[PDB]
Amino acid sequence: PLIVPYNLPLPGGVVPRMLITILGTVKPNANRIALDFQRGNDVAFHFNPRFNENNRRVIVCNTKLDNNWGREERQSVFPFESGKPFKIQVLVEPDHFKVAVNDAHLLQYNHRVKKLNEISKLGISGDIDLTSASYTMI
Numbered sequence: 286p287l288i289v290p291y292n293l294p295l296p297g298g299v300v301p302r303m304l305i306t307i308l309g310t311v312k313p314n315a316n317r318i319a320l321d322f323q324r325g326n327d328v329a330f331h332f333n334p335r336f337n338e339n340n341r342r343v344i345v346c347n348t349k350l351d352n353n354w355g356r357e358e359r360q361s362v363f364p365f366e367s368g369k370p371f372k373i374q375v376l377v378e379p380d381h382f383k384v385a386v387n388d389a390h391l392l393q394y395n396h397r398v399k400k401l402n403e404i405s406k407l408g409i410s411g412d413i414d415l416t417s418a419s420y421t422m423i
């Protein structure tokens with residue numbers, strides 16, 4: 286496969302029990318990946334692996350409102366690897382997005398944007414070959 290940046294419409298927005306699954310392969314020498322769950326121009330949940338931020342690998346999560354980024358949430362568990370296939374699962378729970386990578390729980394992100402049914406697209410960008418992006422209800 287899919288052309289990146291890729292937009293996945295989320296019809297009717299997100300809801301608890303919605304599971305988003307992304308399969309792809311990290312490019313060689315990758316620098317960054319981003320998932321953006323968007324409410325119009327706002328970013329309800331930005332999930333941003335950085336492969337070299339001051340020679341550290343970190344995942345940064347945040348929300349963008351009226352073009353302003355908020356407080357970053359950082360996770361040093363870093364399950365992505367240059368050149369290698371991955372699976373990202375994002376499960377919407379009532380109070381957070383819950384993210385697992387390669388079947389291992391990674392992080393949770395508390396809902397700051399509370400109008401879940403207005404979060405109706407997911408952007409996928411950065412240094413990946415994107416194989417598939419889909420959703421289902423569990």
Ligand SMILES: OC[C@H]1O[C@H](Sc2cccc(F)c2)[C@H](O)[C@@H](n2cc(-c3cc(F)c(F)c(F)c3)nn2)[C@H]1O
Pocket residue numbers: 317318319331333345346347354355356357410411412
């Ligand atoms: O806080 C989160 C943000 O941090 C900074 S801005 C900032 C600085 C200090 C404190 C703070 F709160 C915010 C970044 O520049 C922000 N970013 C990253 C990408 C982006 C685009 C792409 F096309 C990709 F492919 C990609 F992987 C990432 N767009 N925007 C975002 O990550």
